Amino acid sequence: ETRAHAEERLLKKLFSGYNKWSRPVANISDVVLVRFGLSIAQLID
Amino acid sequence: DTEERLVEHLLDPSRYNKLIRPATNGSELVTVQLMVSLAQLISVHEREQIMTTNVWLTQEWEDYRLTWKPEEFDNMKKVRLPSKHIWLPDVVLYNNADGMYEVSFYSNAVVSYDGSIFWLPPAIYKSACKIE
Amino acid sequence: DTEERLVEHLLDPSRYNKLIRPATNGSELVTVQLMVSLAQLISVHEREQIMTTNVWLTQEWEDYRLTWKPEEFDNMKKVRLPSKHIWLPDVVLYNNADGMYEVSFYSNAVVSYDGSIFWLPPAIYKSACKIE
Numbered sequence A: 001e002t003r004a005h006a007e008e009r010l011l012k013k014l015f016s017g018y019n020k021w022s023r024p025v026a027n028i029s030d031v032v033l034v035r036f037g038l039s040i041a042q043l044i045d
Numbered sequence B, C: 001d002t003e004e005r006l007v008e009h010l011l012d013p014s015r016y017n018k019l020i021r022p023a024t025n026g027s028e029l030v031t032v033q034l035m036v037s038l039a040q041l042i043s044v045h046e047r048e049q050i051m052t053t054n055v056w057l058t059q060e061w062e063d064y065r066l067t068w069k070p071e072e073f074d075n076m077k078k079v080r081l082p083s084k085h086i087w088l089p090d091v092v093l094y095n096n097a098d099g100m101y102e103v104s105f106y107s108n109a110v111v112s113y114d115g116s117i118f119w120l121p122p123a124i125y126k127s128a129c130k131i132e
Helices: A002-015 B003-011 C003-009
Strands: B033-045 B050-062 B079-081 B109-111 B116-119 B120-128 C033-045 C050-062 C078-082 C108-113 C116-119 C122-128
Touching: B003 C050, C003 C078
Parallel strands: none
Antiparallel strands: B033 B050, B050 B116, B050 B120, B079 B109, B109 B116, C033 C050, C050 C116, C050 C122, C078 C108, C108 C116
């Protein structure tokens, strides 16, 4: 009925059989595309 | 003993997951009132432009799943929870030398019967300030 | 999906106790082959006799209880594994100044279906050497 109870329910559901070290695609000849990019905060030395 | 039954009731890990935020009523904000309080300026370092201060950072906010009826636990209004076991919003520095972002002690936190949380940890902080 | 069933099969802590060594018949050896690939020589410091270098060392050995029968797991020859949870042979420095003994990243290990384990972590090392 409220938000945080429903958020606790779906965060209980998603980590049932999730595994940390499996490379997460569905078919084995399919790649992921890790998009990258920096931003400088400062240049110290 | 009644303090023990309250501290066991409030931090049930089936009841209380600390990784969520206390949103009610269709995603309201939580309001974190902070004010800072100096203790001593330790050193202004002109050559590498670092100011080292020692500061106390009072944050107080509103929670809603940490209440009780005070008649049921023999008139407690105000208990102490081990800090970092409850939710806390991460409020850090941002212009930092040397990569120490969070606070230094993680002390106790004072819970009322409202749900209002008070928190005051100390820190030493090394900000990187621009020297005229 | 089937790889995820395999990684739940292989590192199962009832099946695979980490800190024993892989041997089967009345204390036979294991063979650890290694070689060193340099990346750069950073510095030779003469005031305190210390050499700072960057080196990737390749170790490969042969385990026996990391085996799967690969037509049951839909023709998989080669998985990756995190190297905190398998056995390691400990290969360290020994003339080390400033006291860091292990490697610096602890990367993944590639495990073939025979059990031959290839491993390549990177390191920086502050070796000690006698300047004449």
